[PDB]
Amino acid sequence: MAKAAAIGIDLGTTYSCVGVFQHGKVEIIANDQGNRTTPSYVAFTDTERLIGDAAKNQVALNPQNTVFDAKRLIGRKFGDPVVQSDMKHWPFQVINDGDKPKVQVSYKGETKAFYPEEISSMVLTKMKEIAEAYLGYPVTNAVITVPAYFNDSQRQATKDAGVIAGLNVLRIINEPTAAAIAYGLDRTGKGERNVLIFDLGGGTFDVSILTIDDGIFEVKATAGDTHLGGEDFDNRLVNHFVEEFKRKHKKDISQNKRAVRRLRTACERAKRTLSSSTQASLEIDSLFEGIDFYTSITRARFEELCSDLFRSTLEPVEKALRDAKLDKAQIHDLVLVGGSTRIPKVQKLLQDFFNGRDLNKSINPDEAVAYGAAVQAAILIKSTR
Numbered sequence: 001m002a003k004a005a006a007i008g009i010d011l012g013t014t015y016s017c018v019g020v021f022q023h024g025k026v027e028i029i030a031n032d033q034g035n036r037t038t039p040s041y042v043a044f045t046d047t048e049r050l051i052g053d054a055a056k057n058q059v060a061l062n063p064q065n066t067v068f069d070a071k072r073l074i075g076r077k078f079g080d081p082v083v084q085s086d087m088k089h090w091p092f093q094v095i096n097d098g099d100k101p102k103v104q105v106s107y108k109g110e111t112k113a114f115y116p117e118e119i120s121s122m123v124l125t126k127m128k129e130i131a132e133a134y135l136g137y138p139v140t141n142a143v144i145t146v147p148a149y150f151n152d153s154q155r156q157a158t159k160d161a162g163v164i165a166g167l168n169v170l171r172i173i174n175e176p177t178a179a180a181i182a183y184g185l186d187r188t189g190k191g192e193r194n195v196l197i198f199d200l201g202g203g204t205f206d207v208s209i210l211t212i213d214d215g216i217f218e219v220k221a222t223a224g225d226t227h228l229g230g231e232d233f234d235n236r237l238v239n240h241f242v243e244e245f246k247r248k249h250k251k252d253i254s255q256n257k258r259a260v261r262r263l264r265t266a267c268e269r270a271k272r273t274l275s276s277s278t279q280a281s282l283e284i285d286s287l288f289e290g291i292d293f294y295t296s297i298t299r300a301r302f303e304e305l306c307s308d309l310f311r312s313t314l315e316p317v318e319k320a321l322r323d324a325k326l327d328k329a330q331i332h333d334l335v336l337v338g339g340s341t342r343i344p345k346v347q348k349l350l351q352d353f354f355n356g357r358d359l360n361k362s363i364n365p366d367e368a369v370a371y372g373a374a375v376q377a378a379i380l381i382k383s384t385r
């Protein structure tokens, strides 16, 4: 029953996803709001602790006590230059507890501090409860994914987050390996198969090159930009609309925190529409000083606004190929991961760079990692019996 069942969890920097392999198919499980991915956010309020969508939805009202980006801290020392650099950009407090970072918040009127693995365990507990509500019984066996560049300390702290969350961690697997499993790229028989995984998420960009030799995975190269993702494209749309509002009304809105956040969420929505329509409409009632902001933008203008950022995704692709010592024609498969890879210009740039090659994109890119993790979790729990 429950003992023979296992889930696959993609514990992402900005979003998390849970899947289950049963009756010959993967089911990506929707949360209680009907969403197939859940924000990796934890909010501490005057009455309760919120996780996911509810935590993300009140971030503007409670920024000091809404934790996100815990994956940037997990398994790291406080003194680590990555931690010191990131801390300057977060609205929540990060404290030092014996060279270990803790996030410090106000919860039910009291000061509380949490280890990054405790924050990640709350996200994991939510994913576990989403699976349990779908299945009708508690599932405790799980495969949890991590970036291919995570070291032993980051992998151990992720497994610790799983234990705190009440999960039996069957295995910690690499995100690009889970994505290659999702597409069945490890079941092509004999001979070395070179796979490039292009992973463009909400806040990070990762390029991974794997060799699959008779079912055995080997990471040949990892490249990317830890501070490039979908939110930089939302911000480019924000700056455009702030300049358009100034041209139409002779009013600078950039200082009104509420106006900027409402414009930001509308821009994120319009950006998603631009992946399947050649135009998107913004409809903001009373954006600033009672002025409605009803406008539109073409996919062509959006592509111009992010042009330099889209083109920058090809430098880590070239870098990964040189580190792996492979030419473009030596790569057998190209896999898309992350919601941002739905952007047609991004697909066109990658396809042209690989001389007109087909891309593996039939599995929802923001779900491919949980999909593969779910497949692996089913194989592993069957072998355990």
Ligand SMILES: Nc1ncnc2c1nc(Cl)n2[C@@H]1O[C@H](CO)[C@@H](O)[C@H]1O
Binding pocket: 015, 200, 201, 202, 203, 229, 230, 231, 268, 271, 272, 273, 275, 338, 339, 340, 341, 342, 343, 366
């Ligand atoms: N249809 C889409 N077109 C463009 N961007 C998208 C799309 N879907 C998602 Cl999710 N994202 C973005 O992916 C990230 C999460 O993986 C977020 O930045 C989200 O906006």
